[PDB]
Amino acid sequence: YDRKRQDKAPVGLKNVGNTCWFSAVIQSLFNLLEFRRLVLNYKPPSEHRNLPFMRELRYLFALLVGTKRKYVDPSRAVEILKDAFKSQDVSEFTHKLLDWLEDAFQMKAEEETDEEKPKNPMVELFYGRFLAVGVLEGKKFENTEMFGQYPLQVNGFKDLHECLEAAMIEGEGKSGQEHWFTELPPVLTFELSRFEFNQALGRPEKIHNKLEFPQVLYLDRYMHRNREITRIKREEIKRLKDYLTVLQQRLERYLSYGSGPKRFPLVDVLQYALEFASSKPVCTSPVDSVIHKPFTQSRIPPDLPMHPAPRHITEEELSVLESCLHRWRTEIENDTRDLQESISRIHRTIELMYSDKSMIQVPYRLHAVLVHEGQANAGHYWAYIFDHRESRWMKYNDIAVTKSSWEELVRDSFGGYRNASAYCLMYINDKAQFLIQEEFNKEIETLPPDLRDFVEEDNQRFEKELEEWDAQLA
Amino acid sequence: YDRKRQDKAPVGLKNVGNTCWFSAVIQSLFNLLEFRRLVLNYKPPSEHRNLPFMRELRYLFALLVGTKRKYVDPSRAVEILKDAFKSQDVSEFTHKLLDWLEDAFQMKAEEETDEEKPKNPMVELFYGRFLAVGVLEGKKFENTEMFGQYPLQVNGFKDLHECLEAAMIEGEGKSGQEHWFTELPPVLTFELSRFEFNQALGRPEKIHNKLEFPQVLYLDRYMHRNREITRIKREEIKRLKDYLTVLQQRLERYLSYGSGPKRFPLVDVLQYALEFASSKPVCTSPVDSVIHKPFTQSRIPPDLPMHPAPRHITEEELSVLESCLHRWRTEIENDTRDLQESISRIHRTIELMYSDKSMIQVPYRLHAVLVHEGQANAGHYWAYIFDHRESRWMKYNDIAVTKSSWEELVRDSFGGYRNASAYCLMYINDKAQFLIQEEFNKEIETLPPDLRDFVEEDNQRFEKELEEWDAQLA
Amino acid sequence: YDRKRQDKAPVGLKNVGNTCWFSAVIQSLFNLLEFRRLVLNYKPPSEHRNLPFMRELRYLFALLVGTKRKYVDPSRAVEILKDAFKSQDVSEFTHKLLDWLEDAFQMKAEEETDEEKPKNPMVELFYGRFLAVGVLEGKKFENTEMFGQYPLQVNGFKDLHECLEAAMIEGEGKSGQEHWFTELPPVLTFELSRFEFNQALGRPEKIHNKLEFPQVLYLDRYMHRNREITRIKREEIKRLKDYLTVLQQRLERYLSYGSGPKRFPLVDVLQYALEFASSKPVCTSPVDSVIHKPFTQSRIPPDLPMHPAPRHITEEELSVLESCLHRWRTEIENDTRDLQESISRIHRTIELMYSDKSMIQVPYRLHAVLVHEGQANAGHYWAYIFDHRESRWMKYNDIAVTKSSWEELVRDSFGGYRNASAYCLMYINDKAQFLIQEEFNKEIETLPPDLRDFVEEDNQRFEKELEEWDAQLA
Amino acid sequence: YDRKRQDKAPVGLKNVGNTCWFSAVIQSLFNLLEFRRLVLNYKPPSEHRNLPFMRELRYLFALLVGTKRKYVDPSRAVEILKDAFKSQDVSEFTHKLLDWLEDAFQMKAEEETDEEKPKNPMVELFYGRFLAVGVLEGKKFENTEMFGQYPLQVNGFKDLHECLEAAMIEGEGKSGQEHWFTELPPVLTFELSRFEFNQALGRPEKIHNKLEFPQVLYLDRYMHRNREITRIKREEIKRLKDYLTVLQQRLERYLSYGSGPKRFPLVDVLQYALEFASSKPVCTSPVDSVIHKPFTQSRIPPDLPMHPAPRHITEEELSVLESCLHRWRTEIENDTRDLQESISRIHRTIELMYSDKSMIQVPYRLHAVLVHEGQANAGHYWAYIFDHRESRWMKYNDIAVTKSSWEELVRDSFGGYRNASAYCLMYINDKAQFLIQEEFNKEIETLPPDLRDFVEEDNQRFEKELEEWDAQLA
């Protein structure tokens, strides 16, 4: 019973009161290096639980870098935003934790207002600004606004793009609105709300559709720059979707054919008709070591007529049927093929609509995925985070930080597969490569003298416990 | 908080360590009046936990008759057979409880061996004797044996008779065995073992087939008296079952027709063929307030050709098809009918095989059903018991004895429906009407002076608690 | 090959060009006696295919009464309304056939305009008049109108009443409309349109919901007389339906419980939890003739721990769980019961809403049901008709008129069960008992001298063919 | 209407009386070059329909090589083996067609018995010899025998190897038998019999299990050479299969857990228990533009208690449950993982058992696959054949020879997917590369002078029809 790091790995967090949402959200910010620098180069500049929190955060980050031991107890910092709702959501606890930083980095960026007016390095990372072409009542309206995480809703949609286009267009002398981005943050986050009313049940629940999202997300379609072209693509998309719907309907009828309540493939009914016509006729079905030549069939049953076959049939009734059906069967076997082939193409076309230079210009690496299993109020949470340097997806589940994969991530995050599902996606701008994923070079020993001390004391303190482990063999 | 009987109802039992199997089995014996007399007319005659048990049983029966309060704590008596396995099944606990009585009623029937040799009134009720026509190895063998509850196994069978015939015949210079009853007990019990190995799983589990049993059971087929006729019926049964199997196979083919992996009703394939032939032809399906007269149809769609229809067709291709199919359809529509009708009859015949005078002569009332929900070692148990006098099925679940029904009973007991299922059936001989269901007449006050006292003391003691309930309003 | 009537049964019709809709609709009018009298007491009074049709109809009715032979060829009469669309629906063919009669009985009721103005005995039977409380635009509007068959639409509804209420109320400064009957015909017909668009498919198809209808239909709720009370019931109905919806939602959650995508009965999860807690603990599951006493169980497996069981458990962890779950299980087992019981009651209440004297006063016998299997343009049709006198449902399928049942009728007519389904219901007023189902008494030989002759000639002509059948044995 | 070859492609066959089995089997032999040489270098050497057949075969092969036109009418040759059953199977028609060749190549190999005794070049290709270690009755027996196509049966098996091992071992003082190959043909064929009795139905039908087979088949395990090692592997295989069965059983219980008839994943029951315990308590459930911060959730419902939650709960009932379940859940979540992981490994191990040098030494290219859709007597047939030179799978369906793929082939041949399924597999020895797939080099014009003439005449004759096609524009 003495378990430390392993070859200087990443360190997890023992979360304390099933408040895992913390470890999830922290580990995401911690692995975003620029923000980690910001938190370590912060001192209290000279709601005021604000500042002792960020001190203990500073202390926990320090620990997360230069501890020798497997995990840390962040409860020191948690306890702070915990009692801060006394005198009660899970997504308010965080909303405050972001206010605290937003406000606290405003405070320490106000040390150079000696010759100046404000500018906030946290708000520089997360927030951006989108324009709103709102033709809201007869007359046109055009509001540009600030935005944090863009919230997206998930019901119905297959992929993220689908899920986003539709989340940015509302309505449409007919009122209406459409968004476009003006300025993206470098650290772009999305919310995926799966909550929806369940009429069968009483109340609103998590939807469970699979919703898939890319490792690389190209945002260029969603901006004023390409406002003109996008809008033109979007028509063609719709007019195509419209088309395949007709093909899909017209296909369904081949596949699911019949006037009755149970319906079968037309292919199969024609095939099975001719089988019965071609069946050897009958009148009374209510009372009763060998060497094989190359292309032969052993075991082929005797051709004794039975079961259902027709009672009689002309030679010139048969060969009419055989002409008619065996022709039609092929008329279907192809029409089906052509309808599937027609659709595949139209799908392909829609896939590629936004796919070349000019529209492959604003790429984003998926950095972190926050996933949640369980009920609305009470869940478990955890996170997937890209290593970047080692270039591998890492799964941060409270104490335990495992090397993971995209394939694994997918099973948890997309939904449908497990009970779990993703709720925050966190993308970072590829172009802003090192504004976020740099390591300020000069040439544990990478920390301010404040923290470098504490972390080393607390190392040594934990070291003694190991001297005491092999000294406790005798 | 003071709840007594209601209009002198039946009284339940607070079972103590999820040992409900007790309340179940006791309440069954208690409601069997003759046995209840026996237990009340027993005094210790002059493994010897045997006797103080039966004293406390005597005391609990007394209570069950003449208490004024809703239930009794039988733990006094339970505790006795509980520690009796120290120095561990649930179906050994009972096996001992029956030994105790069997042995203890032998003891007090040995008070009149002054001029005599033995005879046991308990063993007179439960036990009977069956003969064994065993042609076990070349030569014939014929063993008559005593039997308690006949154990039956349940896998596969629909009804109890099926479940019993097959449980009494084993095998068949070929070895073999068959049982017949010689002497039935008046109080005939059956075990229904649902345990069987589950190859998919590891280990043996409860089967869940529905298995149904009658309110009145006629045993005459199962005896030496009718040995000759039964054996003759059993042939005809088999030779009929054999027959309907052919009808059922030959039917299946009409219903589930096709050479492929998915197969459909022949009726429907012929119907849907003619629909397609009769469909209005087409060449290019891969690229594109009113008064109503009596028998009209509004809303009948326009006849515009579409979707799948054939590319061309002669007038004399059509009317060949129409002749051929519309004929065959009717050839099937009838063959089906005749095959179903043939089967119904054969079923009927088998139902009635053992159904008239000479074979309606040994009837048994289902008296009690013991049912069990839950796993093999740990369950819940309860019982259904016929009132006889009030003539209503009563559901005895530990503390709570509710007026119930045959329909309800059926849902718990038969299996398939709920998780629960019956494991003991307890039938009583109709002819032996009052040897069991009498009430020895003379003309609470129906009990020996011993018990009449205790029960009345303990009444009064419980009465004071009620004086203390309305006296505790102030 | 000579097949005549059987004991003077009813006679069918060999329909000629899969125009069965004729035999269906005719046999319905023929069995409605008053209308049959009308057609036989019609002579051409002195679109003029009108009159030679009705002559051949007169001749076919005559035949249907007094033929000795099994069926008749009505093609003489069919041919007439057939070519009448040359110079093309199936429900126009009939619409004309009704115009012809409607107009032709107007012609022969105009023989007593010598001292008078019109009155039409056909129109007297079929047609009625309904009022329209239409609050159509701000201001109120109130139109009474004539009506033939009331057309009803079927999607969604369970029973006919449901299917009718909703068919008589449209909408609802908000526009709206509601119908009530003013004057019912004695011979009240309804259309059941099952056609609806099928978005999955291309085009509109037959719906297949089961829709049930009564043998006796009480119309009183649907009239101005009870306009006040009905409207009051309809509120209470709605406010109850509203209520049970809440009960049904709140029930669903007990039955289909879980945060995940697959959800199970809460009962079962609690039951299966306690089974696992109560399972005998284990640490390493990834690498490895007897007399039976009455209430015992043979074959109960050994209790060897295995498979999944927990790794460890306190005695005071167990009995907390056992207290908590075994309590909750019962809290659910009852809540479920109470919710089902609550619903049953509310259903009952709604069933009886319109059920006593004052609302059991306008009864209608279902006289005939017209059913149709097959596609929109091309079907098969047939009819069920109540005998009244013999008091038995008769199934008229082209040539073949069989004794049938309500149970059989139900399978064809209601939908869901077979491919077939009913499209016209024909009810008759119970009170107008003999205006329709009389037989004008005086005391084959029940026909005018015209027809009595022809029918007897044509009898004799058919008789000779039978003299020629036993004379053709030699 | 004049359609010839396309860029000198392969030529199909218009089969004549739904006798496609011919085109199938011929095109397979034709594309096997050595056999094609044999048939072209055959002249009648000097049942005697034998020889004029092979003349017309010679003529049809000639045509298949050097025709300019799209297909050929082989009916000349078919007609010959057709009437040869007059004075009636489909797999006798072929059995004769192979006898004819077998016998006819014996005849023309008997032209060099001037100094010799026999040797047959056809029989050299197809036939081989297998040994039979038969311990048939107490004493051992050892028969080596000739064999043509090895017939395999398909029920149950997944892959061909499985399907073959089991087809070569029969039984096992206990009788028994096992085969091993002694001498393989270079052109090794297998039969896949899918016919089996269908007890539910009447009679034997095609099974539809997917059965998969490789493009490259390594036969070394199936021979006397490796008799010793194979037998040793086969034990270890069995003892492993035995093992995973235990793992699979022990897994099933985690996944499909419950005492009742419906059973659910243990994971899910524990998860859903804790959800309900953790549900916010309740007493009466039978009667009643914003900027979002980064990691927040909008739309999270209010926490108002409802529906099912428990009636009450201690703080120290809760945290016992939470300890107990949240622990156990993880105990399962891992045990599952370990059991799946254990199995994957054991599967892998079995896959590789026969997989390295010494057992990768006798490789066979799948050359041709013959597939058949339809009923036992009446089917459609077609073939897939590897090009070798162009190195692409070609689908030969009567007239129409299309460029195809392994992926496509798989859909037709393996079964389960379509109605069709493969019945002959034809493998060729990789090592015997050119004994079969050579082209005897020297340096249409590749044919004897006999055939070179006819084929060119018949070319020119067909050429005139094209002069007549553009000359028939005017």
Numbering used by the authors:
A (entry chain A), B (entry chain A), C (entry chain A), D (entry chain A): 159 to 204, 215 to 255, 261 to 345, 355 to 470, 516 to 670, 678 to 708
Quoted from the paper:
USP25 shows activity in hydrolyzing K48- and K63-linked polyubiquitin chains and is a target for different post-translational modifications including phosphorylation, SUMOylation, and ubiquitination. Human USP25 is a modular protein composed by three domains: an NTD (Met1 to Tyr159), a central USP-like domain (Asp160 to Glu714), and a CTD (Lys715 to Arg1055). Strikingly, the USP25 structure displays a homotetramer quaternary assembly and the catalytic domain can be divided in three differentiated subdomains: a general palm-like catalytic domain (USP-like), a long coiled-coil (LCC), and an “inhibitory loop” (IL-loop or IL). In our USP25 structure, each IL-loop inserts into the catalytic domain from another molecule of the tetramer, thus preventing substrate binding and thereby impairing USP25 activity.
Interestingly, only the tetramer assembly of USP25 gave rise to single crystals. Initial diffraction of the USP25 crystals was poor, never beyond 6 Å resolution; however, after conducting a lysine methylation protocol, diffraction was notably improved, and thus finally collecting a 3.28 Å resolution dataset. The crystals belonged to the I422 space group, and contained one molecule per asymmetric unit. The USP25 structure was solved by SAD using mercurial derivatives, three of which were located bound to three cysteine residues (one corresponding to the active site cysteine). The structure of USP25 reveals the presence of a homotetramer quaternary assembly composed by the interaction of four different USP25 molecules from the crystal lattice. PISA server analysis also predicts that the tetramer structure of USP25 (A4), with a buried surface area of 23,730 Å2, is formed by the assembly of two homodimers (2 × A2). Each homodimer composing the USP25 tetramer is comprised by an extended contact interface that includes approximately half of the LCC coiled-coil domain, forming a four-helix bundle motif, which would act as a dimerization hub between two USP-like catalytic domains, resembling a “pair of cherries” with the knot at the end of their stems. The LCC-IL-loop insertion domain also participates in the tetramer interface, but in contrast to the dimer, the interaction occurs with the catalytic domain of the opposite dimer. Two contact areas can be distinguished in the tetramer interface: between the extended IL-loop which is deeply inserted into the S1 ubiquitin-binding surface of the catalytic domain (c in green and Supplementary Figure 4c); and between the LCC1 “kink” motif with residues from the loop connecting β9–β10 strands of the catalytic domain.
